[PDB]
Amino acid sequence: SPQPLEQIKLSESQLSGRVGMIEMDLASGRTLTAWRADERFPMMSTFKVVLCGAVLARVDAGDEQLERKIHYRQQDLVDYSPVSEKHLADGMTVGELCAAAITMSDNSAANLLLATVGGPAGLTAFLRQIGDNVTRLDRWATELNEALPGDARDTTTPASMAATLRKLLTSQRLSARSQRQLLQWMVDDRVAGPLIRSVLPAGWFIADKTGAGERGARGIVALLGPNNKAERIVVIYLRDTPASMAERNQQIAGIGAALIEHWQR
Template sequence: MRIRSLAKLLTMGALSLSLSAPGQAQTKDYSAQFDQVLGTEVRAPQSFDAVYDNALEQRISQLADGSRGRIGVYAIDLSTGQEIGILADQRFPMASTSKVAIAATYLAGVDAGKWSLTSEWRLPRPGGAHLSARQHIDLMISKSCNDCTDALLAAVGGPRAVNQWMRNAGLEEFELTRDIATLIREDGRVDPASSVDLRDSATPRAMGQLLAGIYQGKWLSTSSRNVLMNAMRATTTGKKRMRSALPTGAGLAHKTGTLSRTASDIGIFHTPDGRAIAAAIYVTGQSPSMAVENGNRSRKLEARQMRDARISTIAGALYRGFASQDDDRRVWADADYGG
């Protein structure tokens, strides 16, 4: 059995790891047990060859060192099907990366004739203006506008509708439970570096496959796909994350996410020979504890910069690794990224 398959079984509960539930939140405090079983808690160099089965994945596993917080990575070459996965089947906080799924759900409704891009929806705040759906999508993706997101989330029928669209797309490891206003209000109650809160979470694999399917036109019309991809190309947030590591010619289209003790970036970029790579990077922690980080303003800024730097470094390694690799289908002959 390949180690990756074993990892997926473990994260799905094959070891019957304990669950805890603060309020209505289900949390899995199994990270240490997971890493202990796979030999990735310390991630000593001598364990890399035993755990990961190609040079690029071994390199990414080094850069995704989990000693100061959980880091999840998933990437797939859409031309060859070659994948890279480091804790790719563990749940991570989506933060604003969930906005891609919300936008896709709305655009699928446009394709079905339920509403249009010119339909106007009111910003959910006192005196909120009415904006067209196209404006909401552009702002919620490129500028990460939270009010725009909640306006469209309400329009499609709330989190349940987004979850259903994702299930219909074959993406199970995704769960949206709150609107963005509530998510921000409740941020910081669970430390994502040491616990897994299933609310508003997804696996890096699910988010990477969401991007892959959107890019490949599997679920949206060409016009709707272009609306979303163009908004992602115009993203201005997270300048020190993926964007800082990739050349302009990579044509990055991406969406960032940020909450307490977590940062993320998911996107599509291209190798010099034109192959599209879908990647999802989720980074938590990077400082000793939530109390230390939140109790010291300078330490909080330092930790955030470290999270951004981790994303940048990993994205750069993915770009160079996929760009330099031969077409090696041997490792990933059984890859299934169709969603």
């Protein structure tokens, strides 16, 4: 594979779309690679990690409990609810809802949690509270993935998302237990995690949340590193490409390969 920036450029050329990327040291925030890092991209399902950071903040404040059971109705369900559709009779705890939202990308679980933090506006206010003045959630799950050109709704920037994830995972804004919980939910991703491990060389750590949307939107927020350590945050977003899902996945994997082969920078 070529150097990271050369591979990122190659991916735009091959996809005819925009790629946004940040590679950042998790412990210090040192930015290593930045490409269109201040440009907007639809967050898609990656917003679910920030959502659960807001839930954990409420738990830390004593305004929520991960144990609290939420009972919901079938009419509350939206498209793609693999875990929540199985619990109409018994409900799910707030912690179970975050696990379903992050590890299975369950949309009804995400919406139930979104209401607890004040909806899209409440989550956006939380982002402003932690110093992210760019990321914004405007719609509920299912409609936030529309990815219309020029539409600023439900977007982030690679730089903003990377800084926000670092703040949630390591800045001590969340309690120690909450920081550990958010990380474990990403480690536990069932949608892409196992697949990524299957193609990663031995010794590489992965934790992640992926997303997909219209007009080719695709993305991933991840922790990656050799020696089985979450050394870096890597955020990659793609937008406005007509390519197949398989090729969008292949290009993101290609950028990851370039990082792996040329890690010491």
